[PDB]
Amino acid sequence: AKWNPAGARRPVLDEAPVFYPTEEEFEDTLKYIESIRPMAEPYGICRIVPPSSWKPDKSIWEGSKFSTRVQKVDKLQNRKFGFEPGPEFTLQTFQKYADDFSKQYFVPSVEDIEGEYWRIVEVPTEEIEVIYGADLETGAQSGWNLNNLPRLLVPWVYVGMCFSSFCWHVEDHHLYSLNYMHWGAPKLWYGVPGKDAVNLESAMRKHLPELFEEQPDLLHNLVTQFSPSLLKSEGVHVYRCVQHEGEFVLTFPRAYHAGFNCGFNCAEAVNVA
Ligand SMILES: O=C(O)CNC(=O)C(=O)O
Ligand SMILES: [Fe+3]
């Protein structure tokens, strides 16, 4: 039903690296990624802010329908078999649903929302359910237009609202993931480097044993959130970054990531080799 500010459980984490390419570096997507890899790879994830140069509809906004799934945020980590289908929406109607939910639940800052999100997942006091559009199949000249990367695997669309989540997972086939936020509220990302994958899975098996018994293949299901604070206590390196609209997040082969949204937003991501 509503916010408890004093009950906040915001993770205390190191920030993932942020990159500010120049127009020249930016002119070659694949080449730029390659160049920052040595620096960014040990973190599993990184944020890329495009230069000023870079700069990318009623019938769609109001016309194109998509379906959603329902998430019980209070059950993502602690529960005694996943995301049921939700209503169909358009961007317009989804936004209004999304905006009213936040207005009533709570203008909070990103850190306010993040502290509340983890309160709901670690120590819930009520059922909170939320809706997201994921897996929506779409729908200069540079690979930053995600539709062009498979060339030089198809782009996928994500519509989020406050507290909607993407639970811990690695990309298929040790692929990179490149994610662009088209517009809307910030998305919180938590990343673990490939070399720490074993520590992460093992921390999860240790603390959520009964969950693994009934679902031996949890780690593939995308249905389980797990606190960075718990990970941190098991010696796992978790890095945070906050993605704003107009910004990319890049995930490295074999890196685990998870996160949630601070409000209504729209993003597109693709896998790259
Ligand atoms: O954007 C989301 O909600 C989730 N995206 C991913 O997990 C992907 O970019 O690797
Ligand atoms: Fe992903």
mmCIF file with all atom_site columns, C-alpha atoms in Angstrom, residues 43-222:
data_model
loop_
_atom_site.group_PDB
_atom_site.id
_atom_site.type_symbol
_atom_site.label_atom_id
_atom_site.label_alt_id
_atom_site.label_comp_id
_atom_site.label_asym_id
_atom_site.label_entity_id
_atom_site.label_seq_id
_atom_site.pdbx_PDB_ins_code
_atom_site.Cartn_x
_atom_site.Cartn_y
_atom_site.Cartn_z
_atom_site.occupancy
_atom_site.B_iso_or_equiv
_atom_site.pdbx_formal_charge
_atom_site.auth_seq_id
_atom_site.auth_comp_id
_atom_site.auth_asym_id
_atom_site.auth_atom_id
_atom_site.pdbx_PDB_model_num
ATOM 1   C CA . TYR A 1 43  ? 33.094 -5.057  -13.020 1.00 0.00 ? 43  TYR A CA 1
ATOM 2   C CA . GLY A 1 44  ? 30.780 -7.160  -15.185 1.00 0.00 ? 44  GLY A CA 1
ATOM 3   C CA . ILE A 1 45  ? 28.717 -4.123  -16.131 1.00 0.00 ? 45  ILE A CA 1
ATOM 4   C CA . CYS A 1 46  ? 29.217 -0.521  -17.168 1.00 0.00 ? 46  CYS A CA 1
ATOM 5   C CA . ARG A 1 47  ? 27.331 2.561   -18.169 1.00 0.00 ? 47  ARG A CA 1
ATOM 6   C CA . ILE A 1 48  ? 27.986 4.492   -21.367 1.00 0.00 ? 48  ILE A CA 1
ATOM 7   C CA . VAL A 1 49  ? 26.780 8.079   -21.726 1.00 0.00 ? 49  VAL A CA 1
ATOM 8   C CA . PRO A 1 50  ? 26.590 9.188   -25.416 1.00 0.00 ? 50  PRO A CA 1
ATOM 9   C CA . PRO A 1 51  ? 28.167 12.494  -26.608 1.00 0.00 ? 51  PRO A CA 1
ATOM 10  C CA . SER A 1 52  ? 26.124 15.606  -27.507 1.00 0.00 ? 52  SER A CA 1
ATOM 11  C CA . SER A 1 53  ? 26.225 14.713  -31.183 1.00 0.00 ? 53  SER A CA 1
ATOM 12  C CA . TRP A 1 54  ? 24.115 11.621  -30.614 1.00 0.00 ? 54  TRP A CA 1
ATOM 13  C CA . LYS A 1 55  ? 20.374 12.143  -30.847 1.00 0.00 ? 55  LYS A CA 1
ATOM 14  C CA . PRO A 1 56  ? 17.657 9.698   -31.993 1.00 0.00 ? 56  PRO A CA 1
ATOM 15  C CA . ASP A 1 57  ? 4.575  8.953   -32.525 1.00 0.00 ? 57  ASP A CA 1
ATOM 16  C CA . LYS A 1 58  ? 0.806  8.974   -31.896 1.00 0.00 ? 58  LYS A CA 1
ATOM 17  C CA . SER A 1 59  ? -0.095 5.819   -33.810 1.00 0.00 ? 59  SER A CA 1
ATOM 18  C CA . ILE A 1 60  ? 2.391  3.829   -31.721 1.00 0.00 ? 60  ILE A CA 1
ATOM 19  C CA . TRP A 1 61  ? 2.014  5.601   -28.378 1.00 0.00 ? 61  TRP A CA 1
ATOM 20  C CA . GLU A 1 62  ? -1.762 5.193   -28.493 1.00 0.00 ? 62  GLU A CA 1
ATOM 21  C CA . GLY A 1 63  ? -2.137 2.379   -31.019 1.00 0.00 ? 63  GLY A CA 1
ATOM 22  C CA . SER A 1 64  ? 0.354  -0.465  -30.611 1.00 0.00 ? 64  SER A CA 1
ATOM 23  C CA . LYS A 1 65  ? -0.731 -3.006  -27.991 1.00 0.00 ? 65  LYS A CA 1
ATOM 24  C CA . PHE A 1 66  ? 1.601  -5.171  -25.890 1.00 0.00 ? 66  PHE A CA 1
ATOM 25  C CA . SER A 1 67  ? 1.051  -7.703  -23.131 1.00 0.00 ? 67  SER A CA 1
ATOM 26  C CA . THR A 1 68  ? 2.427  -7.774  -19.599 1.00 0.00 ? 68  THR A CA 1
ATOM 27  C CA . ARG A 1 69  ? 3.216  -10.052 -16.712 1.00 0.00 ? 69  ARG A CA 1
ATOM 28  C CA . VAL A 1 70  ? 2.469  -9.636  -13.021 1.00 0.00 ? 70  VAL A CA 1
ATOM 29  C CA . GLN A 1 71  ? 5.211  -9.509  -10.388 1.00 0.00 ? 71  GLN A CA 1
ATOM 30  C CA . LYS A 1 72  ? 4.727  -9.979  -6.647  1.00 0.00 ? 72  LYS A CA 1
ATOM 31  C CA . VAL A 1 73  ? 7.667  -7.893  -5.421  1.00 0.00 ? 73  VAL A CA 1
ATOM 32  C CA . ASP A 1 74  ? 7.270  -9.177  -1.838  1.00 0.00 ? 74  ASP A CA 1
ATOM 33  C CA . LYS A 1 75  ? 7.857  -12.758 -3.055  1.00 0.00 ? 75  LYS A CA 1
ATOM 34  C CA . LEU A 1 76  ? 10.925 -12.329 -5.298  1.00 0.00 ? 76  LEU A CA 1
ATOM 35  C CA . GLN A 1 77  ? 13.456 -13.575 -2.746  1.00 0.00 ? 77  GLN A CA 1
ATOM 36  C CA . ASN A 1 78  ? 11.466 -14.869 0.243   1.00 0.00 ? 78  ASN A CA 1
ATOM 37  C CA . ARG A 1 79  ? 8.780  -17.428 -0.606  1.00 0.00 ? 79  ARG A CA 1
ATOM 38  C CA . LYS A 1 80  ? 7.663  -20.798 0.796   1.00 0.00 ? 80  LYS A CA 1
ATOM 39  C CA . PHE A 1 81  ? 5.451  -20.738 -10.397 1.00 0.00 ? 81  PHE A CA 1
ATOM 40  C CA . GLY A 1 82  ? 6.503  -17.283 -11.595 1.00 0.00 ? 82  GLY A CA 1
ATOM 41  C CA . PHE A 1 83  ? 5.078  -14.323 -13.477 1.00 0.00 ? 83  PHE A CA 1
ATOM 42  C CA . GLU A 1 84  ? 1.428  -14.727 -14.452 1.00 0.00 ? 84  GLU A CA 1
ATOM 43  C CA . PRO A 1 85  ? 0.041  -12.891 -17.485 1.00 0.00 ? 85  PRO A CA 1
ATOM 44  C CA . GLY A 1 86  ? -1.322 -9.380  -17.048 1.00 0.00 ? 86  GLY A CA 1
ATOM 45  C CA . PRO A 1 87  ? -3.622 -7.108  -19.042 1.00 0.00 ? 87  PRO A CA 1
ATOM 46  C CA . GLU A 1 88  ? -2.813 -5.875  -22.513 1.00 0.00 ? 88  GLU A CA 1
ATOM 47  C CA . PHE A 1 89  ? -1.800 -2.209  -22.753 1.00 0.00 ? 89  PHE A CA 1
ATOM 48  C CA . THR A 1 90  ? -0.602 0.600   -24.948 1.00 0.00 ? 90  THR A CA 1
ATOM 49  C CA . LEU A 1 91  ? 2.279  2.879   -23.939 1.00 0.00 ? 91  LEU A CA 1
ATOM 50  C CA . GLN A 1 92  ? -0.317 5.551   -23.178 1.00 0.00 ? 92  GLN A CA 1
ATOM 51  C CA . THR A 1 93  ? -2.501 3.439   -20.881 1.00 0.00 ? 93  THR A CA 1
ATOM 52  C CA . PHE A 1 94  ? 0.488  1.644   -19.320 1.00 0.00 ? 94  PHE A CA 1
ATOM 53  C CA . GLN A 1 95  ? 2.006  5.036   -18.409 1.00 0.00 ? 95  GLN A CA 1
ATOM 54  C CA . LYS A 1 96  ? -1.181 6.200   -16.726 1.00 0.00 ? 96  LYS A CA 1
ATOM 55  C CA . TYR A 1 97  ? -1.463 2.955   -14.776 1.00 0.00 ? 97  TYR A CA 1
ATOM 56  C CA . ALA A 1 98  ? 2.232  3.206   -13.847 1.00 0.00 ? 98  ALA A CA 1
ATOM 57  C CA . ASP A 1 99  ? 2.075  6.873   -12.798 1.00 0.00 ? 99  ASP A CA 1
ATOM 58  C CA . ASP A 1 100 ? -0.970 6.407   -10.581 1.00 0.00 ? 100 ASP A CA 1
ATOM 59  C CA . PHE A 1 101 ? 0.625  3.468   -8.823  1.00 0.00 ? 101 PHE A CA 1
ATOM 60  C CA . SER A 1 102 ? 3.722  5.498   -7.828  1.00 0.00 ? 102 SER A CA 1
ATOM 61  C CA . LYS A 1 103 ? 1.706  8.581   -6.932  1.00 0.00 ? 103 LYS A CA 1
ATOM 62  C CA . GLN A 1 104 ? -0.299 6.558   -4.427  1.00 0.00 ? 104 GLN A CA 1
ATOM 63  C CA . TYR A 1 105 ? 2.500  4.346   -3.109  1.00 0.00 ? 105 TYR A CA 1
ATOM 64  C CA . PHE A 1 106 ? 4.614  7.393   -2.134  1.00 0.00 ? 106 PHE A CA 1
ATOM 65  C CA . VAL A 1 107 ? 8.420  12.875  -5.355  1.00 0.00 ? 107 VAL A CA 1
ATOM 66  C CA . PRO A 1 108 ? 11.033 10.369  -4.126  1.00 0.00 ? 108 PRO A CA 1
ATOM 67  C CA . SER A 1 109 ? 14.676 10.304  -5.226  1.00 0.00 ? 109 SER A CA 1
ATOM 68  C CA . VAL A 1 110 ? 16.316 7.233   -6.819  1.00 0.00 ? 110 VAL A CA 1
ATOM 69  C CA . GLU A 1 111 ? 17.903 6.376   -3.445  1.00 0.00 ? 111 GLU A CA 1
ATOM 70  C CA . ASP A 1 112 ? 14.521 6.700   -1.693  1.00 0.00 ? 112 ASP A CA 1
ATOM 71  C CA . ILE A 1 113 ? 12.983 4.283   -4.203  1.00 0.00 ? 113 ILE A CA 1
ATOM 72  C CA . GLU A 1 114 ? 15.934 1.858   -4.073  1.00 0.00 ? 114 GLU A CA 1
ATOM 73  C CA . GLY A 1 115 ? 15.859 1.680   -0.281  1.00 0.00 ? 115 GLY A CA 1
ATOM 74  C CA . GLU A 1 116 ? 12.117 0.979   -0.428  1.00 0.00 ? 116 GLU A CA 1
ATOM 75  C CA . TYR A 1 117 ? 12.460 -1.633  -3.178  1.00 0.00 ? 117 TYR A CA 1
ATOM 76  C CA . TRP A 1 118 ? 14.915 -3.686  -1.137  1.00 0.00 ? 118 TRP A CA 1
ATOM 77  C CA . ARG A 1 119 ? 12.752 -3.231  1.964   1.00 0.00 ? 119 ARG A CA 1
ATOM 78  C CA . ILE A 1 120 ? 9.889  -4.848  0.010   1.00 0.00 ? 120 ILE A CA 1
ATOM 79  C CA . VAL A 1 121 ? 12.049 -7.716  -1.188  1.00 0.00 ? 121 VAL A CA 1
ATOM 80  C CA . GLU A 1 122 ? 13.978 -8.445  2.067   1.00 0.00 ? 122 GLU A CA 1
ATOM 81  C CA . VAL A 1 123 ? 11.449 -7.548  4.781   1.00 0.00 ? 123 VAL A CA 1
ATOM 82  C CA . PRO A 1 124 ? 7.974  -7.109  3.238   1.00 0.00 ? 124 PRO A CA 1
ATOM 83  C CA . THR A 1 125 ? 5.012  -5.859  5.251   1.00 0.00 ? 125 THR A CA 1
ATOM 84  C CA . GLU A 1 126 ? 2.386  -6.204  2.473   1.00 0.00 ? 126 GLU A CA 1
ATOM 85  C CA . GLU A 1 127 ? 1.767  -7.843  -0.892  1.00 0.00 ? 127 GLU A CA 1
ATOM 86  C CA . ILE A 1 128 ? 2.907  -5.472  -3.614  1.00 0.00 ? 128 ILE A CA 1
ATOM 87  C CA . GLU A 1 129 ? 2.185  -6.429  -7.179  1.00 0.00 ? 129 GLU A CA 1
ATOM 88  C CA . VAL A 1 130 ? 3.446  -4.713  -10.257 1.00 0.00 ? 130 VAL A CA 1
ATOM 89  C CA . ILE A 1 131 ? 3.331  -5.074  -14.039 1.00 0.00 ? 131 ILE A CA 1
ATOM 90  C CA . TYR A 1 132 ? 5.904  -5.092  -16.803 1.00 0.00 ? 132 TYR A CA 1
ATOM 91  C CA . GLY A 1 133 ? 6.146  -5.517  -20.528 1.00 0.00 ? 133 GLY A CA 1
ATOM 92  C CA . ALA A 1 134 ? 9.125  -7.652  -21.372 1.00 0.00 ? 134 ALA A CA 1
ATOM 93  C CA . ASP A 1 135 ? 10.285 -9.677  -24.321 1.00 0.00 ? 135 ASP A CA 1
ATOM 94  C CA . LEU A 1 136 ? 8.282  -7.523  -26.694 1.00 0.00 ? 136 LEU A CA 1
ATOM 95  C CA . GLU A 1 137 ? 9.597  -8.262  -30.185 1.00 0.00 ? 137 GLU A CA 1
ATOM 96  C CA . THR A 1 138 ? 10.312 -5.070  -32.110 1.00 0.00 ? 138 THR A CA 1
ATOM 97  C CA . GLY A 1 139 ? 8.097  -3.506  -32.799 1.00 0.00 ? 139 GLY A CA 1
ATOM 98  C CA . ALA A 1 140 ? 23.092 6.176   -37.514 1.00 0.00 ? 140 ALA A CA 1
ATOM 99  C CA . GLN A 1 141 ? 24.433 3.968   -39.260 1.00 0.00 ? 141 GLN A CA 1
ATOM 100 C CA . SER A 1 142 ? 26.298 3.121   -36.013 1.00 0.00 ? 142 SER A CA 1
ATOM 101 C CA . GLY A 1 143 ? 25.729 0.016   -33.913 1.00 0.00 ? 143 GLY A CA 1
ATOM 102 C CA . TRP A 1 144 ? 24.262 2.285   -31.239 1.00 0.00 ? 144 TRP A CA 1
ATOM 103 C CA . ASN A 1 145 ? 21.072 1.904   -33.173 1.00 0.00 ? 145 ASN A CA 1
ATOM 104 C CA . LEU A 1 146 ? 20.550 -1.572  -31.783 1.00 0.00 ? 146 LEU A CA 1
ATOM 105 C CA . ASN A 1 147 ? 18.744 -2.811  -34.906 1.00 0.00 ? 147 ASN A CA 1
ATOM 106 C CA . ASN A 1 148 ? 22.109 -2.642  -36.714 1.00 0.00 ? 148 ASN A CA 1
ATOM 107 C CA . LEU A 1 149 ? 24.382 -4.611  -34.369 1.00 0.00 ? 149 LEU A CA 1
ATOM 108 C CA . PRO A 1 150 ? 23.362 -8.165  -35.361 1.00 0.00 ? 150 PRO A CA 1
ATOM 109 C CA . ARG A 1 151 ? 24.645 -7.094  -38.802 1.00 0.00 ? 151 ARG A CA 1
ATOM 110 C CA . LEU A 1 152 ? 28.160 -5.881  -38.006 1.00 0.00 ? 152 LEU A CA 1
ATOM 111 C CA . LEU A 1 153 ? 19.938 -12.054 -32.673 1.00 0.00 ? 153 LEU A CA 1
ATOM 112 C CA . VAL A 1 154 ? 17.197 -9.442  -32.643 1.00 0.00 ? 154 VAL A CA 1
ATOM 113 C CA . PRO A 1 155 ? 16.605 -6.381  -30.390 1.00 0.00 ? 155 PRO A CA 1
ATOM 114 C CA . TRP A 1 156 ? 14.127 -6.761  -27.532 1.00 0.00 ? 156 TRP A CA 1
ATOM 115 C CA . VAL A 1 157 ? 11.843 -4.208  -25.873 1.00 0.00 ? 157 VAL A CA 1
ATOM 116 C CA . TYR A 1 158 ? 11.266 -3.623  -22.135 1.00 0.00 ? 158 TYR A CA 1
ATOM 117 C CA . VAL A 1 159 ? 8.498  -1.505  -20.604 1.00 0.00 ? 159 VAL A CA 1
ATOM 118 C CA . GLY A 1 160 ? 8.885  -0.940  -16.886 1.00 0.00 ? 160 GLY A CA 1
ATOM 119 C CA . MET A 1 161 ? 7.209  0.785   -13.993 1.00 0.00 ? 161 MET A CA 1
ATOM 120 C CA . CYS A 1 162 ? 8.213  1.517   -10.404 1.00 0.00 ? 162 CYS A CA 1
ATOM 121 C CA . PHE A 1 163 ? 9.507  -1.660  -8.682  1.00 0.00 ? 163 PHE A CA 1
ATOM 122 C CA . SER A 1 164 ? 9.230  -3.883  -11.760 1.00 0.00 ? 164 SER A CA 1
ATOM 123 C CA . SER A 1 165 ? 12.296 -6.114  -11.846 1.00 0.00 ? 165 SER A CA 1
ATOM 124 C CA . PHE A 1 166 ? 14.643 -8.240  -13.855 1.00 0.00 ? 166 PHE A CA 1
ATOM 125 C CA . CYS A 1 167 ? 15.945 -10.981 -11.583 1.00 0.00 ? 167 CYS A CA 1
ATOM 126 C CA . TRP A 1 168 ? 19.532 -12.281 -11.566 1.00 0.00 ? 168 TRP A CA 1
ATOM 127 C CA . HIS A 1 169 ? 20.678 -13.896 -14.833 1.00 0.00 ? 169 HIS A CA 1
ATOM 128 C CA . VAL A 1 170 ? 23.544 -14.351 -17.295 1.00 0.00 ? 170 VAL A CA 1
ATOM 129 C CA . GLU A 1 171 ? 23.057 -13.875 -21.061 1.00 0.00 ? 171 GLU A CA 1
ATOM 130 C CA . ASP A 1 172 ? 22.913 -16.968 -23.278 1.00 0.00 ? 172 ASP A CA 1
ATOM 131 C CA . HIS A 1 173 ? 26.180 -18.141 -24.880 1.00 0.00 ? 173 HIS A CA 1
ATOM 132 C CA . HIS A 1 174 ? 28.497 -15.754 -23.022 1.00 0.00 ? 174 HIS A CA 1
ATOM 133 C CA . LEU A 1 175 ? 27.144 -12.915 -25.131 1.00 0.00 ? 175 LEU A CA 1
ATOM 134 C CA . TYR A 1 176 ? 27.398 -9.245  -24.246 1.00 0.00 ? 176 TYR A CA 1
ATOM 135 C CA . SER A 1 177 ? 24.203 -7.333  -23.645 1.00 0.00 ? 177 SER A CA 1
ATOM 136 C CA . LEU A 1 178 ? 23.806 -3.728  -24.768 1.00 0.00 ? 178 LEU A CA 1
ATOM 137 C CA . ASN A 1 179 ? 20.785 -1.857  -23.344 1.00 0.00 ? 179 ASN A CA 1
ATOM 138 C CA . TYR A 1 180 ? 19.539 1.582   -24.344 1.00 0.00 ? 180 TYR A CA 1
ATOM 139 C CA . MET A 1 181 ? 16.881 3.508   -22.459 1.00 0.00 ? 181 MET A CA 1
ATOM 140 C CA . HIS A 1 182 ? 14.643 5.367   -24.902 1.00 0.00 ? 182 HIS A CA 1
ATOM 141 C CA . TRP A 1 183 ? 12.813 7.439   -22.303 1.00 0.00 ? 183 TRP A CA 1
ATOM 142 C CA . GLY A 1 184 ? 11.291 7.476   -18.836 1.00 0.00 ? 184 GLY A CA 1
ATOM 143 C CA . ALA A 1 185 ? 12.426 6.905   -15.271 1.00 0.00 ? 185 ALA A CA 1
ATOM 144 C CA . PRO A 1 186 ? 15.835 5.564   -14.141 1.00 0.00 ? 186 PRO A CA 1
ATOM 145 C CA . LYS A 1 187 ? 16.653 1.860   -14.064 1.00 0.00 ? 187 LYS A CA 1
ATOM 146 C CA . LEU A 1 188 ? 18.847 0.471   -11.266 1.00 0.00 ? 188 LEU A CA 1
ATOM 147 C CA . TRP A 1 189 ? 21.405 -2.111  -12.356 1.00 0.00 ? 189 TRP A CA 1
ATOM 148 C CA . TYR A 1 190 ? 23.423 -4.488  -10.228 1.00 0.00 ? 190 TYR A CA 1
ATOM 149 C CA . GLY A 1 191 ? 26.301 -6.319  -11.850 1.00 0.00 ? 191 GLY A CA 1
ATOM 150 C CA . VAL A 1 192 ? 28.593 -9.164  -10.868 1.00 0.00 ? 192 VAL A CA 1
ATOM 151 C CA . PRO A 1 193 ? 31.754 -10.001 -12.925 1.00 0.00 ? 193 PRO A CA 1
ATOM 152 C CA . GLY A 1 194 ? 32.074 -13.386 -14.662 1.00 0.00 ? 194 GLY A CA 1
ATOM 153 C CA . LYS A 1 195 ? 34.894 -14.523 -12.352 1.00 0.00 ? 195 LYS A CA 1
ATOM 154 C CA . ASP A 1 196 ? 32.464 -14.114 -9.447  1.00 0.00 ? 196 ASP A CA 1
ATOM 155 C CA . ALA A 1 197 ? 29.620 -16.126 -11.042 1.00 0.00 ? 197 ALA A CA 1
ATOM 156 C CA . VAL A 1 198 ? 30.452 -19.192 -8.911  1.00 0.00 ? 198 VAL A CA 1
ATOM 157 C CA . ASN A 1 199 ? 30.404 -17.131 -5.715  1.00 0.00 ? 199 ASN A CA 1
ATOM 158 C CA . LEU A 1 200 ? 26.987 -15.683 -6.651  1.00 0.00 ? 200 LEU A CA 1
ATOM 159 C CA . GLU A 1 201 ? 25.302 -18.998 -7.467  1.00 0.00 ? 201 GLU A CA 1
ATOM 160 C CA . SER A 1 202 ? 26.897 -20.555 -4.455  1.00 0.00 ? 202 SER A CA 1
ATOM 161 C CA . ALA A 1 203 ? 25.741 -17.694 -2.184  1.00 0.00 ? 203 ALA A CA 1
ATOM 162 C CA . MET A 1 204 ? 22.209 -18.252 -3.535  1.00 0.00 ? 204 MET A CA 1
ATOM 163 C CA . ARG A 1 205 ? 22.244 -22.050 -3.010  1.00 0.00 ? 205 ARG A CA 1
ATOM 164 C CA . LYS A 1 206 ? 23.545 -21.490 0.511   1.00 0.00 ? 206 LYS A CA 1
ATOM 165 C CA . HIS A 1 207 ? 20.839 -18.973 1.548   1.00 0.00 ? 207 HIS A CA 1
ATOM 166 C CA . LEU A 1 208 ? 17.882 -20.149 -0.537  1.00 0.00 ? 208 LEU A CA 1
ATOM 167 C CA . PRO A 1 209 ? 18.272 -23.932 -0.230  1.00 0.00 ? 209 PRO A CA 1
ATOM 168 C CA . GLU A 1 210 ? 14.558 -24.799 -0.107  1.00 0.00 ? 210 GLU A CA 1
ATOM 169 C CA . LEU A 1 211 ? 13.996 -22.795 -3.301  1.00 0.00 ? 211 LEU A CA 1
ATOM 170 C CA . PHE A 1 212 ? 16.610 -24.811 -5.232  1.00 0.00 ? 212 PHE A CA 1
ATOM 171 C CA . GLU A 1 213 ? 15.122 -28.096 -4.053  1.00 0.00 ? 213 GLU A CA 1
ATOM 172 C CA . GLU A 1 214 ? 11.718 -27.387 -5.611  1.00 0.00 ? 214 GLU A CA 1
ATOM 173 C CA . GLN A 1 215 ? 13.287 -25.623 -8.622  1.00 0.00 ? 215 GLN A CA 1
ATOM 174 C CA . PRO A 1 216 ? 16.660 -27.265 -9.376  1.00 0.00 ? 216 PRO A CA 1
ATOM 175 C CA . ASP A 1 217 ? 16.998 -24.900 -12.367 1.00 0.00 ? 217 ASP A CA 1
ATOM 176 C CA . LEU A 1 218 ? 16.182 -21.569 -10.662 1.00 0.00 ? 218 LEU A CA 1
ATOM 177 C CA . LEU A 1 219 ? 19.204 -19.777 -12.113 1.00 0.00 ? 219 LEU A CA 1
ATOM 178 C CA . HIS A 1 220 ? 17.753 -20.090 -15.634 1.00 0.00 ? 220 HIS A CA 1
ATOM 179 C CA . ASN A 1 221 ? 14.187 -19.101 -14.725 1.00 0.00 ? 221 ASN A CA 1
ATOM 180 C CA . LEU A 1 222 ? 14.594 -15.324 -14.150 1.00 0.00 ? 222 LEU A CA 1
#
